[PDB]
Amino acid sequence: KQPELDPDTPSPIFGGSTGGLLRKAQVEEFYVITWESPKEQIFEMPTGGAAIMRKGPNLLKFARKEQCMALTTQLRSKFRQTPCFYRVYADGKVQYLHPKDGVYPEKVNAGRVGVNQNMRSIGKNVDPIKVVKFTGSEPFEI
Amino acid sequence: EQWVTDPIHVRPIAHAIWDPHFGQPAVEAFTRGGASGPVNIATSGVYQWWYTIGLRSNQELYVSSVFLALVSA
Amino acid sequence: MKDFTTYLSTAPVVGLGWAIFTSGLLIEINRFFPDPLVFSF
Amino acid sequence: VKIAVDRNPVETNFEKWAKPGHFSRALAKGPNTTTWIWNLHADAHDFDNHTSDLEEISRKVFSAHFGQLGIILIWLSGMYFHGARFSNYEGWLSDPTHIKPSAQVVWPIVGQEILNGDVGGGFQGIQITSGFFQLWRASGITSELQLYSTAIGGLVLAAACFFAGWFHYHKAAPKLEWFQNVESMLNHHLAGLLGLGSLAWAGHQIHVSLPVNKLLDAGVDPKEIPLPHEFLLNQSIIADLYPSFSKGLAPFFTLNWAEYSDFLTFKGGLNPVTGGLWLSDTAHHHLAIAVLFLVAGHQYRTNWGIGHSIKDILESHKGPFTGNGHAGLYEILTTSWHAQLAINLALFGSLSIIVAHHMYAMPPYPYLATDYGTQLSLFTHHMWIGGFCVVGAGAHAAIFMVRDYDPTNNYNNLLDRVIRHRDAIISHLNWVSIFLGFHSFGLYIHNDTMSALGRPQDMFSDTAIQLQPVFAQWIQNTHFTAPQLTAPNALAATSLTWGGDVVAVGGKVAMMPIALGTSDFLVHHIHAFTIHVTVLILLKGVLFARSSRLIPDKANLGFRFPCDGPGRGGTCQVSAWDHVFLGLFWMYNSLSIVIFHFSWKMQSDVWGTVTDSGVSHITGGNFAQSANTINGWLRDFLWAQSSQVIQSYGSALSAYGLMFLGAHFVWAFSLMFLFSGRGYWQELIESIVWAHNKLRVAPSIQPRALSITQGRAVGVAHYLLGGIATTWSFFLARIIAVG
Amino acid sequence: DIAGLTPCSESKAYNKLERKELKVLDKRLKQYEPGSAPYLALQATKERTENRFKTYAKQGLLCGNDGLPHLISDPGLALRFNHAGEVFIPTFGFLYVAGYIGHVGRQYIILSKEDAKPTDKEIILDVPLALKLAFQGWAWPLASIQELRNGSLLEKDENITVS
Amino acid sequence: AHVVKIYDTCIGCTQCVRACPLDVLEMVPWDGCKAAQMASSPRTEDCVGCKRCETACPTDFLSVRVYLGNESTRSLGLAY
Numbered sequence A: 001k002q003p004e005l006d007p008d009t010p011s012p013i014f015g016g017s018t019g020g021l022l023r024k025a026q027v028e029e030f031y032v033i034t035w036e037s038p039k040e041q042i043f044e045m046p047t048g049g050a051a052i053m054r055k056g057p058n059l060l061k062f063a064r065k066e067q068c069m070a071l072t073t074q075l076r077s078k079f080r081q082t083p084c085f086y087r088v089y090a091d092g093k094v095q096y097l098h099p100k101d102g103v104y105p106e107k108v109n110a111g112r113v114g115v116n117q118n119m120r121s122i123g124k125n126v127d128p129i130k131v132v133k134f135t136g137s138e139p140f141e142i
Numbered sequence B: 001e002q003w004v005t006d007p008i009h010v011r012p013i014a015h016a017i018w019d020p021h022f023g024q025p026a027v028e029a030f031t032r033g034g035a036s037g038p039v040n041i042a043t044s045g046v047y048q049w050w051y052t053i054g055l056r057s058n059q060e061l062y063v064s065s066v067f068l069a070l071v072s073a
Numbered sequence C: 001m002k003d004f005t006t007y008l009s010t011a012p013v014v015g016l017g018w019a020i021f022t023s024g025l026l027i028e029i030n031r032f033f034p035d036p037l038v039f040s041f
Numbered sequence D: 001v002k003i004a005v006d007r008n009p010v011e012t013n014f015e016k017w018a019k020p021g022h023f024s025r026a027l028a029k030g031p032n033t034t035t036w037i038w039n040l041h042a043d044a045h046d047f048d049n050h051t052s053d054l055e056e057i058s059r060k061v062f063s064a065h066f067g068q069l070g071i072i073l074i075w076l077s078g079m080y081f082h083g084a085r086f087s088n089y090e091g092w093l094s095d096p097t098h099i100k101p102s103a104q105v106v107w108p109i110v111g112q113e114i115l116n117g118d119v120g121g122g123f124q125g126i127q128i129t130s131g132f133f134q135l136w137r138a139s140g141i142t143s144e145l146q147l148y149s150t151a152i153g154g155l156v157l158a159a160a161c162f163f164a165g166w167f168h169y170h171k172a173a174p175k176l177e178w179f180q181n182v183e184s185m186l187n188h189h190l191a192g193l194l195g196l197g198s199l200a201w202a203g204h205q206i207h208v209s210l211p212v213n214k215l216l217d218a219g220v221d222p223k224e225i226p227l228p229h230e231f232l233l234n235q236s237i238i239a240d241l242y243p244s245f246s247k248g249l250a251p252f253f254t255l256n257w258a259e260y261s262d263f264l265t266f267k268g269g270l271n272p273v274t275g276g277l278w279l280s281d282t283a284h285h286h287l288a289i290a291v292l293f294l295v296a297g298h299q300y301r302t303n304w305g306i307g308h309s310i311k312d313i314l315e316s317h318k319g320p321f322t323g324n325g326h327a328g329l330y331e332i333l334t335t336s337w338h339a340q341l342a343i344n345l346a347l348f349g350s351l352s353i354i355v356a357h358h359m360y361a362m363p364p365y366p367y368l369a370t371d372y373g374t375q376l377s378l379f380t381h382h383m384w385i386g387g388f389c390v391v392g393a394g395a396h397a398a399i400f401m402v403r404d405y406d407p408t409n410n411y412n413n414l415l416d417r418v419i420r421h422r423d424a425i426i427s428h429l430n431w432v433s434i435f436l437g438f439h440s441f442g443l444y445i446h447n448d449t450m451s452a453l454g455r456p457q458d459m460f461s462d463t464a465i466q467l468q469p470v471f472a473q474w475i476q477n478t479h480f481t482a483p484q485l486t487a488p489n490a491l492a493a494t495s496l497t498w499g500g501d502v503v504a505v506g507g508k509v510a511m512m513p514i515a516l517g518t519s520d521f522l523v524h525h526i527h528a529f530t531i532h533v534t535v536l537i538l539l540k541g542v543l544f545a546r547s548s549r550l551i552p553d554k555a556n557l558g559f560r561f562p563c564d565g566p567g568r569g570g571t572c573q574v575s576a577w578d579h580v581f582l583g584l585f586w587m588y589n590s591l592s593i594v595i596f597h598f599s600w601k602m603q604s605d606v607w608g609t610v611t612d613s614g615v616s617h618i619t620g621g622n623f624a625q626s627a628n629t630i631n632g633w634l635r636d637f638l639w640a641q642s643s644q645v646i647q648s649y650g651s652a653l654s655a656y657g658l659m660f661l662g663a664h665f666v667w668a669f670s671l672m673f674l675f676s677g678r679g680y681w682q683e684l685i686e687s688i689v690w691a692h693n694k695l696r697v698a699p700s701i702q703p704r705a706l707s708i709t710q711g712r713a714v715g716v717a718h719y720l721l722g723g724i725a726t727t728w729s730f731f732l733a734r735i736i737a738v739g
Numbered sequence E: 001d002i003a004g005l006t007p008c009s010e011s012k013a014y015n016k017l018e019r020k021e022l023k024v025l026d027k028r029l030k031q032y033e034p035g036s037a038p039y040l041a042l043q044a045t046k047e048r049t050e051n052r053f054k055t056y057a058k059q060g061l062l063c064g065n066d067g068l069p070h071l072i073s074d075p076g077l078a079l080r081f082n083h084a085g086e087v088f089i090p091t092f093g094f095l096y097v098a099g100y101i102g103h104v105g106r107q108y109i110i111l112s113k114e115d116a117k118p119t120d121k122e123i124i125l126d127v128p129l130a131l132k133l134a135f136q137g138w139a140w141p142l143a144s145i146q147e148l149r150n151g152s153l154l155e156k157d158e159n160i161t162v163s
Numbered sequence F: 001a002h003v004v005k006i007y008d009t010c011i012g013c014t015q016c017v018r019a020c021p022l023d024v025l026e027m028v029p030w031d032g033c034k035a036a037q038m039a040s041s042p043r044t045e046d047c048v049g050c051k052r053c054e055t056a057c058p059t060d061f062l063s064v065r066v067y068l069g070n071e072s073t074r075s076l077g078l079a080y
């Protein structure tokens, strides 16, 4: 069960910085991350300095998506902690992205069907002949 | 006209200047011709090519300029 | 001694030994033979 | 604090040389690509890249220090031995006024002997602008027989220095406990290395002030001058020279310092006949330095409960705004060598430039003020060294922040507070640089436009509309009225650059006061602009190294990387290495502007020959109404002063023109690298490799083009090389034909 | 007479340049006594300068309206005259030396392609092998032509291309 | 956006995913030797085009190639 975003979640103790949180975050979108973080500890922020983190699930949020994938990968690095992602649009609609499979896209989950791929040797593509349409960047099969 | 008669004693002129930024010495420095105010020498080589083909009047130049404007339109 | 002779195959050897031989030879030829600009015949 | 070394930590053997790149396990496997060699070269000194053993890193650094000082001592010995064997030092010594210094004589091979300029003294050779003859004259040297022994001593000391390096690396390799003795390192550098050396050199200048001040400046031939040992021991001699001696050394025991006035004297200034300064002032200054740096090295608790350590002092400094500051800066320094190196190079280059500024207007030697060439040489040399040192400090700051940094134990609220507003500083300095560019460079555009439009009465000028500074003039006023008003015991002012009294030695004015007008105002604003832009580059490289607004995962990519990828429109020159790359160019620009200002001021409003009626300078005062326009720098300074560098093929100065053209060449050559990439070059190498494989002559090592980082490195290297070499050739061929 | 140039002895500008150089040398040669070192240095310099100007004018080298020597590089003008040494034989000498060098380097780089890790041999050379091959290449024109007729230098199109 | 493709030349090393900074591509069934995974691009609204996935892909020739397309707020990495 992919968990959905929950407002009114406490935040880690930190002073402030000058990264992100601009006009884009108010009228376009903002991204959210949540993760366990037991054993209240010290961590580093991708757009700031060092901060403390209580035990129990805690939630953060930033401006760009990579600003949270960096934290997910960090959490991989040291102690096995398992955060998640969230999307937000102007209408308030929320979308869950990472990890949809729940098993961290680097590992397969029981079964799905992927797109944007073709069974052809590297190269051996089509010459610019018969490619006058050019459809932006061709999938070569659609 | 000042070029066809004695093409050795004179030099070409390209266009004039209405720039208010020039000072009094500037108007006195860009006045090689003497028949008008500040001017600029003509380095296009158009006098020679226009006189070799045959031209000794400014009206003959106005005519061609109007003709070229018409063909452009 | 062995590792030293092996070390003596790198930049600090021919590339130094070479081009030292050559600079010396050219300088000596230009010193004994002062100013050539054309062959004897 | 104690000593802690290990016995035979690394056995001495020529094996590890047979495997280049052993220090990097990635390189030790083998050179399968031509990039292997360049990485071998670019990483041999990268001690913290070999392994994370900071003990081994500290040992490597403490050994490379001796490795450098050995070369330093062999260099000084080589200078002394050049002065000894082949030079006109005796001829110069018998007649310093007209004879010029020469210590290099070329070999007759292909006509290069023309470089042996006729300098007199019965000897011909290459003129030297290093300043060793004037430095040696202040030591009572009378003949060449002394420099031989001095060079012998220097070479023995250099051999012993390499010995000590090998000893402390392979026989007495210390531990981190000894290296991290900040208390001991300070109280022995500050007190011992500085105080003891200063006291020894002051005692030296005190007992060598006889020849220079009295005998050398009385027409006495150096052979006629009694040797220094004949001055030291005989009490009758030092009683005849200075009456303050032979008293009995009584005033120094009871501290009744009243009779010591013939050798510790405070005068200031110089005689327009003696050319140089006096040794008594330098002796008193060195005694002051010795006492000061010896007492200062005694303000730290080490063992016997006397004093206070550095950690307690750092802990007892906190304020309302920051709070809990200076928490782990002691560990900041004791942990990484890069932090200490960056902190040192920070003000090391700045103090080098300050030494340049204190040398050009205060020549601390005899018979060199008239030598208009040595001053420019040393001034520009030290300023470029200072610029490089400052840029290197900017680089090593980011180096520290990359490898040796973690805000957990070295945590400090000061550093994180600086980081938390790392963007407002950059934005405001951007705005300030825009201000200075529109307000210091646009003025030259306005002046050119006004001079071209035929309105000279509207151009900025000391005659049309004055824009000269007064604050610097008020500082010069406070220094001028300082004697007898705010400096009672003082005789003269700080320097003769603002106090009239045109001092001339043999026609050539040794010193004339320097004016400050609209031109100096504009040029100092240009200097501030360039320096602020350089600091902007360096600081924006240092801060945006751990994290940024675009790429958060920036620390893992390291310190030396060209980019991240052509994504988000394009990422290029984002690493701190690239910011140091650009800071090198900006330091070049700033230092070049400053040195051109120096040269042209000194040649227009300072230097010249004095006639019966006043002084006739080199140039006819072309500094007033030429600096106010960019064309002026090409009107009377660059165009005018370049005649010698291009007209010196007929004399021994042709090598200057050769270096001139070659530096132009290498500069454009650097442009080649700076404007190109690798794709084109790699594919061209591909086709060339095709051409090779047809005859089966290609190499086994895969020939690849240079790395992007190495491409930019070669670019900047050739660029600064060409620039500095061209400017060197110019300033060194122009100043010989005018002095 | 070729190209309007005249033999370099009959050039008034050439002799004027020689006199100019000698005057410029003597004006600062008169600064020193005949016993000191700089004087002997200038004496020897003048010696080999006069030798420059004397030895050039033999077997014929054309100087132009400027009096300076001008090399003739066409075979055929160096023939039918005496100019084969201006640049005709130096061409063959450089070709010989460059052959020599390339031959030795190629045979080295080939004989190293057989042992394990040849890359090492390119950063740690085989000094005795290089010395042996260095003293065996001065017949390379013989070995090159017949190694060409042999075919041991043409690779039978087994290399990496893209097209 | 950025048209990303994955050819049949692949071994399923799971490296171009533990290297992608934006978690764009997935790895779902493939019939391999020891790991048996193949990469796929189900979504591209967040792909910036950094070509970090092309550096870690050890396939010769590369299994993934980013066809550079048009830019957006996500594709330009704009926090504003």
Ligand SMILES: CC1=C(C/C=C(\C)CCC[C@H](C)CCC[C@H](C)CCCC(C)C)C(=O)c2ccccc2C1=O
Residues within 6 Å of the ligand: C015, C019, D672, D673, D674, D676, D677, D678, D681, D705, D706, D707, D708, D710, D711, D712
């Ligand atoms: C030409 C060029 C190269 C190619 C650079 C090369 C090929 C440097 C190689 C030259 C060295 C000096 C080869 C010398 C090595 C010799 C084979 C052996 C040395 C000779 C001995 C006698 C020492 C780049 O890599 C590059 C990168 C980024 C921007 C622009 C450029 C660029 O313009």
Ligand code: SF4
Residues within 6 Å of the ligand: D567, F004, F019, F020, F021, F022, F023, F024, F025, F046, F047, F048, F049, F050, F051, F052, F053, F054, F066
């Ligand atoms: S280009 Fe960058 S963001 Fe896009 S799929 Fe590849 S690694 Fe991920």
Ligand code: SF4
Residues within 6 Å of the ligand: F006, F009, F010, F011, F012, F013, F014, F015, F016, F017, F037, F038, F039, F056, F057, F058, F059, F063, F064
């Ligand atoms: S990185 Fe390349 S080879 Fe590896 S799983 Fe991804 S597409 Fe396949």
